[PDB]
Structure 1
Amino acid sequence: MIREERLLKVLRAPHVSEKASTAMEKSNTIVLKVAKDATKAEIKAAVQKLFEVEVEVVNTLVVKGKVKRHGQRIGRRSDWKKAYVTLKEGQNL
């Protein structure tokens, strides 16, 4: 079954920011980058399997890429998706 490998692949990298730290310290949530699709059920299952923690609900959003001009040539950064996984009273990382 490729469910496990898909769950491993959906998670790409965490997101670090002042808002992320505030959310972690107050609301007990971790914000991390996810795959382009990264459906809620799949990301929740991947978090449960990998971080061996318990979560309440997961909501995600799409961040539109910025258009930057390198030299005289324009270019739009690739779109990336971020998900906020809310941990329960018991969290480890």
Structure 2
Amino acid sequence: MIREERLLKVLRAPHVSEKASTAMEKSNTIVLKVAKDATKAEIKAAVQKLFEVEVEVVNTLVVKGKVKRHGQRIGRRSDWKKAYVTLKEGQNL
């Protein structure tokens, strides 16, 4: 099918909120970080359903977790999946 609205829990944060993200928003693409087990078709259907805008293609990259912690206590941030949602037809930006 088109994947279910319950299973469309992939859209976590709508914006990475960065200079690169705003630059490719003002030119062409929406940048947002989605899930850990999402697929390209899942993010495409999520954008087309949860937003009103149709989507051309989705480009996904997995971001590693930073350590970012001192010497006495050692920690590691969570690995997160980013997507580059390209939407050309039917866009307002």
Q: TM-score, normalised by structure 2?
A: 0.80
Against the structure 1 CA distance between its residues 21 and 2, is the aligned structure 2 distance closer, same or farther, given a 3 Å change threshold? closer
Question: Which runs of no fewer than 5 residues in structure 2 stay unpaired?
Answer: none
Distance change in 2, residues 1:22/1:3 (3 Å): closer
| 8 A Cα contact 1:33 1:82, kept in partner | yes
Q: Is the 8 A contact 1:68 1:75 kept in 2?
A: yes
CA contact under 8 A between 1:11 and 1:34: conserved in structure 2?
yes
Alignment: residue pair count? 93
Q: Could you tell me how far apart the structure 2 residues matched to 1:91 and 1:68 are? A: 38
Query: For the residues of structure 2 that align with 1:85 and 1:36, how far apart are their CA atoms?
Result: 16
Contact 2:65-2:76 within 8 A present in 1 as well: yes
More helix, by proportion: 1
TM-score, reference length from structure 1: 0.80
- Bigger share in strand: 1
- Which runs of 5 or more residues in structure 1 are unaligned? none
Aligned-pair distance for 1:70? 4.5
Contact persistence 1:36–1:80 (CA under 8 A) = yes
